Amino acid sequence: IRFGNPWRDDYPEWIWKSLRVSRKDKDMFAPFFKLLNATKLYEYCLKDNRRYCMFVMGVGLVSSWMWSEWWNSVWRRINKGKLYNDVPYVYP
Amino acid sequence: VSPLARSVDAAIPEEAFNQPPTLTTTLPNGIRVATQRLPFHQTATVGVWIDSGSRYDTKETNGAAHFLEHMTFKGTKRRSRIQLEQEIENMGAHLNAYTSREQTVYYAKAFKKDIPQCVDILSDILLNSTIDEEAVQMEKHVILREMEEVERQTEEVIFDRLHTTAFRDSPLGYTILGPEENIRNMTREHILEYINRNYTSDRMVVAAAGDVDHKELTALVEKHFAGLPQPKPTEKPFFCGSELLHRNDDMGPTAHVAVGFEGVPWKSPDAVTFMLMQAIVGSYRKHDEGIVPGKVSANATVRNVCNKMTVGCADMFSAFNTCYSDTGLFGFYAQCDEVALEHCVMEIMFGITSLSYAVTDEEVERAKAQLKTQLLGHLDSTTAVAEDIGRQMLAYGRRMPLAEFLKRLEVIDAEEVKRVAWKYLHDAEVAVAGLGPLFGMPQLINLRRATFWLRY
């Protein structure tokens, strides 16, 4: 037993080998970065800090509300027939 | 109405247009000849400009280009070394040479009557030098001593290391001298391989200036360079953003630094604007100052540096712009005290970042004035003119006359500078090199986040 043992501890050979592997001059997500760079979001909205702030504020404004309404819909979808609106009271 | 509005207005003087022509002609084998005659001179300059340098070594023989510069003076098939030296001296002339990353130059000065001989000599040593192995094995002593001395001139080592850290992936990275082991391992076959791969007729131009006639020069070139051989894609060098710092506390109190940005090629439309931006940032020396105190100077960068902590934070700083065939460098070099280094550097980075936000036309016109003074002030002697002819012939395929340069410089205003800077320098990558007491030194990420302002 080499693990946790001050008399013997050392890495297994397969861990010593995992450190020899190489991915130099390779990249597998380049298409995504090329797409994003093609949208020219940086040139128009993020390269100037005043516009950076405008972007932050407006995207906040809209995203928050969309997220809210989506969670509302989920809350109604999971709880169907349990909430107050779904089961009207009928008078005697 | 008022006389104060009647002043004479001449942006460009008439002399800018009344200049003698530059005459050009291409010989059948592809060699190009250029000339300009200047009536107010008695002598002339003539030489050869070659479109090759250390960028065209191969990584195995890096340093061969520079070795050939020495070999060409060792002897030829027609004349021995003693004969060659005495035939340099007995003319009472000058002969110079040098090489660089992309260009190599040879030239001489003489009275008109000795231009033929000069051409002859030049051709000889370029075409017919005997690269003897038992002389190659001796020039190694001199080249090693040359390298030994070069390591003591700090500005040059700083710029070399800036090129090393900026162009890791390209032969622009190579130093002109080459490594030590390559100086020891150099061999005749390497030198001859460099020659037979780079010395082709399309790459050479012959230029003169002074009391010269285009016809006779063209005939002489036709006579002597008939033996030069004729010729038989590449991609843009990548620019890396990195630092290369040599910390050393046993060489006194002074720290040296250089910072660089990616530039533009010779032929780029914005080249001129770059030439102007270099002047807008300018330079300063604490020792020698002219007649304007730094604390009141019209240059805002100098002014801000000289007023720091009331004592001022730099020994020297100077900006620079260098253009190559397909890329450039743009930046500055500085010297300052151990404890001043941080301000010493960030003031000038603030300088350069101002060009994209807040520069105004007072500054632009001051810089135009100084730039014009400098450039138009150099071109006085025959050597300067011949060098300019050849340099422009290689860089552009032509020579640009003074009027054109002035007309293109005139129409640049502040908004144009503020456009180009925003195009190339705002939020860019930078490369850094330094030497000495660098405990103060800023982080790479500091210098890189400096390139934009969060204000605005």
Ligand SMILES: CCCCCCCCCCCCCCCCCC(=O)OC[C@H](COP(=O)([O-])OCC(O)COP(=O)([O-])OC[C@@H](COC(=O)CCCCCCCCCCCCCCCCC)OC(=O)CCCCCCCCCCCCCCCCC)OC(=O)CCCCCCCCCCCCCCCCC
């Ligand atoms: C409980 C209360 C708690 C309060 C906590 C508050 C914390 C805020 C900290 C402020 C930021 C740090 C300031 C340090 C500056 C250093 C000096 C300097 O040289 O700076 C140069 C720098 C200028 O850059 P430069 O010189 O051109 O070059 C920059 C370099 O190139 C490159 O830059 P660099 O790499 O050198 O880095 C510079 C760095 C320097 O900093 C650092 O290096 C260290 C990091 C800084 C601290 C980070 C942690 C702070 C946490 C932020 C969140 C706090 C929320 C608190 C809310 C309380 C809730 C109960 O500065 C920044 O980047 C700071 C950015 C963040 C500040 C801007 C926030 C304002 C947004 C307002 C939006 C509108 C909201 C309205 C609604 C009301 C909201 C309450 O100055 C700045 O930009 C700094 C910020 C300036 C302040 C702007 C105005 C602020 C007022 C906001 C509105 C107030 C709303 C109140 C209304 C309430 C309605 C009910």
Ligand SMILES: [Zn+2]
């Ligand atoms: Zn040398």
